[PDB]
Amino acid sequence: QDGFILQQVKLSLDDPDSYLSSWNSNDASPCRWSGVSCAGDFSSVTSVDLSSANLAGPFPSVICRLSNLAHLSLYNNSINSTLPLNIAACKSLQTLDLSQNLLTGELPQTLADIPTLVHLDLTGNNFSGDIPASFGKFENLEVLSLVYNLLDGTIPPFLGNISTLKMLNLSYNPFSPSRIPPEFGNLTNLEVMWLTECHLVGQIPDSLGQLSKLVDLDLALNDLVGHIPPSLGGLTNVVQIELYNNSLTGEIPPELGNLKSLRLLDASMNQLTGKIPDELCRVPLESLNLYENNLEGELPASIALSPNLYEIRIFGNRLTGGLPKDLGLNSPLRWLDVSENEFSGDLPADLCAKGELEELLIIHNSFSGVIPESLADCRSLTRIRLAYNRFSGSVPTGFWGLPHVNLLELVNNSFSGEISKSIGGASNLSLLILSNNEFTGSLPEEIGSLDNLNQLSASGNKFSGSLPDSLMSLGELGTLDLHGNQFSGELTSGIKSWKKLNELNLADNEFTGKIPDEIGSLSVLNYLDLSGNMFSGKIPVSLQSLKLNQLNLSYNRLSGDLPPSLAKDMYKNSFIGNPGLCGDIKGLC
Ligand SMILES: *[C@@H]1O[C@H](CO[C@@H]2O[C@@H](C)[C@@H](O)[C@@H](O)[C@@H]2O)[C@@H](O[C@@H]2O[C@H](CO)[C@@H](O)[C@H](O)[C@H]2NC(C)=O)[C@H](O[C@@H]2O[C@@H](C)[C@@H](O)[C@@H](O)[C@@H]2O)[C@H]1NC(C)=O
Ligand SMILES: *[C@@H]1O[C@H](CO)[C@@H](O[C@@H]2O[C@H](CO)[C@@H](O[C@@H]3O[C@H](CO)[C@@H](O)[C@H](O)[C@@H]3O)[C@H](O)[C@H]2NC(C)=O)[C@H](O)[C@H]1NC(C)=O
Ligand SMILES: *[C@@H]1O[C@H](CO)[C@@H](O[C@@H]2O[C@H](CO)[C@@H](O)[C@H](O)[C@H]2NC(C)=O)[C@H](O[C@@H]2O[C@@H](C)[C@@H](O)[C@@H](O)[C@@H]2O)[C@H]1NC(C)=O
Ligand SMILES: *[C@@H]1O[C@H](CO)[C@@H](O[C@@H]2O[C@H](CO)[C@@H](O)[C@H](O)[C@H]2NC(C)=O)[C@H](O)[C@H]1NC(C)=O
Ligand SMILES: *[C@@H]1O[C@H](CO)[C@@H](O[C@@H]2O[C@H](CO)[C@@H](O)[C@H](O)[C@H]2NC(C)=O)[C@H](O)[C@H]1NC(C)=O
Ligand SMILES: *[C@@H]1O[C@H](CO)[C@@H](O[C@@H]2O[C@H](CO)[C@@H](O)[C@H](O)[C@H]2NC(C)=O)[C@H](O)[C@H]1NC(C)=O
Ligand SMILES: *[C@@H]1O[C@H](CO)[C@@H](O[C@@H]2O[C@H](CO)[C@@H](O)[C@H](O)[C@H]2NC(C)=O)[C@H](O)[C@H]1NC(C)=O
Ligand SMILES: *[C@@H]1O[C@H](CO)[C@@H](O)[C@H](O)[C@H]1NC(C)=O
Ligand SMILES: *[C@@H]1O[C@H](CO)[C@@H](O)[C@H](O)[C@H]1NC(C)=O
Ligand SMILES: *[C@@H]1O[C@H](CO)[C@@H](O)[C@H](O)[C@H]1NC(C)=O
């Protein structure tokens, strides 16, 4: 009969990829059929897995006529229409996975009438309306997943009545704004509470502290208010706490230090105040994210003790004092973001000791001293932002040439010395921002070797000498800003090679000679500033062809007529401070 029933399933579904080709009526048994598994001396179908088969059409309710069917998966198909109340006919089902389908309408209340059901996954469907009251009466359910549906009812307290529940997954539903039922604290066996983006309102219940077996608490992306409960110290087995993007206030409880198994804490994007507790930092955390809060005081040195720490993101706070001296020495630190704080003192000497540091983001702080010499050997680095600090000294030779660095931002510091020839080694460099420093010397020829470079901003420095001829080799360059320097010499026909250049700013330098006619060849140039230089001769006629939002050729030695487009009252400020250009425009001189 199992074969005949499965033939009825086949006739009820669209099978464009012929996944059910093997479903042959002439077969003695259906056990060898695609997606079918049998058990017992009877060769009874016990499992059907038609996942990722590109099957389409309504749920095949006739499949429930299989007496011994214990596992059904139609995961990742185009199963559509409503889930029938006839699903209760599947009385032997232990696991049901209908995730990633096109199922619509209300959840059938008869799902709770399957006593054997342990796993229910309806994730990634279009189910809407209230969660049925029957769902409170599930006999043996351990996993309930309704993630990414259109459920628009309130979160029901009766879900707390499922004593056997180990995972409650209701994340990513447009639920009517609802408080977390305190009855959820009575789910003694619960290991996962996943309520991300569930339109939660009100305060986290103290009852949630009763969940001794909880491994993951996720209440992120909601409108939760009030304080993180000190009762959460009762979460003995918790490893992950996600409270990010809420409206939580008050201080981080020191009782979080009692959570020995805690490795991941993210309470970022809240209104938390007070200091980060030493007790929490004593826990050997893997990730601590407390960014975009109103936290103050020092970062406890105990955080450096963790052997598992790879991530610290505490940016956008009012934290003071120095970073821990041993930070990175005992941990595989990968991501460090302490930006927009009040941190001071030298950077820790061994941030990259374990050789895994990828992101060093410390902008808008009062960090001082020289870049640690160890960081010159940190080849793992991909993004470096030391901008808006009080750093001094030369940038270490190795630091310039780090191979995987895509962004090097040293803007607004007191950095001195020269860009080393080692910069040629920076194959991955796309953005180089060194503006507002005391850098000296000439740009190295090795800068031209950086084919991937898109931005070179080094304004407000003491750079000098002729631009390297290799600078033409920067075909991918979109921004070149060298204003407020002592750069000398002349531009060449090589500037034509800057095909993708949108901005050229060489203002307030000592440049001499004619502006090359090849300036017109730069099709996407929208910003040109050559002001405060000694550029001489006629303005290139080709400049008319360029569409420029900003043009400044002021305070130069330029002479002769303007192209007709540029000869306008609006462009007077662009050509002031040039004796030769006088009388090109009425009221210029
Ligand atoms: C439920 O899915 C049925 C199977 O269709 C295929 O899979 C869909 C997910 C979609 O990719 C579709 O393009 C596939 O053809 C639909 O049936 C059919 O509808 C299509 C037009 O969309 C038609 O060309 C087919 O001949 C027709 N086949 C069968 C066996 O009915 C259901 O569609 C609905 O009913 C149709 C008769 C038609 O009136 C259509 O407008 C309806 O949407 C799908 N039902 C729902 C509720 O979406
Ligand atoms: C109910 O929700 C929980 C929490 O989202 C789901 O649990 C978790 O499942 C994911 C995906 O399987 C796990 O992620 C990964 O880690 C493993 C290594 O252990 C790795 O191989 C994967 O590539 C992935 O990175 C996650 O660790 C796990 N978390 C917990 C706390 O258990 C659960 O699957 C959901 N159940 C249903 C039916 O929706
Ligand atoms: C979790 O289950 C407990 C046991 O059923 C609840 O406690 C009890 O409360 C009942 C009324 O809600 C009462 O009839 C029971 O006699 C009592 N049982 C025991 C052993 O205490 C508990 O409810 C809460 O705690 C009690 C003391 C009251 O303060 C109630 O207002 C609470 O809701 C359940 N917890 C939750 C959060 O529902
Ligand atoms: C969901 O099922 C579909 C259909 O089996 C999977 O789609 C295909 O992806 C594989 C691997 O990239 C390709 O070789 C096939 O050509 C694709 N087929 C179709 C019809 O798109 C899809 O990968 C599955 N998704 C998941 C997350 O498992
Ligand atoms: C809470 O859960 C219990 C246990 O699943 C539910 O209890 C039963 O109620 C159903 C239908 O009313 C009966 O068929 C069962 O025989 C009852 N079993 C037991 C062990 O009492 C109870 O209804 C649920 N309550 C809520 C509000 O959902
Ligand atoms: C970044 O550095 C620049 C240059 O030092 C700062 O800009 C100027 O502000 C100072 C006063 O603090 C003036 O005396 C200068 O004339 C300004 N220079 C220029 C070129 O505009 C800028 O304020 C700094 N930004 C931050 C956030 O610290
Ligand atoms: C081109 O650059 C010159 C020099 O920086 C600019 O000149 C001055 O204009 C500003 C704003 O009106 C005044 O505050 C300064 O006093 C002027 N300085 C001098 C030395 O004259 C000019 O405005 C810029 N023009 C454009 C179009 O950007
Ligand atoms: C499911 O809901 C989404 C979002 O409202 C919509 O874009 C999609 O077309 C819906 N699909 C079905 C089958 O109702
Ligand atoms: C945080 O939530 C707000 C809505 O309150 C949303 O606009 C924003 O994109 C979210 N940001 C992150 C990083 O989750
Ligand atoms: C370049 O840096 C980016 C991150 O900015 C990274 O994803 C990429 O893998 C790097 N590529 C190389 C070749 O280092």
Numbering used by the authors: 18 to 606
Q: Any passages from the paper?
A:
Here we demonstrate that HSL1 binds IDA/IDL peptides with high, and CLE peptides with lower affinity, respectively. Ligand sensing capability and receptor activation of HSL1 require a SERK co-receptor kinase. Our work reveals that HSL1 is a receptor for IDA/IDL signaling peptides.
To characterize the sequence-related HSL1 receptor, we determined the crystal structure of the apo HSL1 ectodomain at 1.83 Å resolution. HSL1 folds into a superhelical assembly of 21 LRRs with a conserved ligand-binding surface, suggesting a shared peptide recognition mechanism with the receptors HAE/HSL2. In contrast, we did not detect binding of CLE9 to the isolated ectodomain of HSL1 in ITC assays. Structural superimposition of the CLE-receptor PXY25 and HSL1 highlights that HAE-type and CLE-sensing receptors have evolved different peptide-binding surfaces in their LRR domain: HSL1 features a set of bulky amino acids in the N-terminal part of the binding surface, incompatible with specific CLE peptide perception.
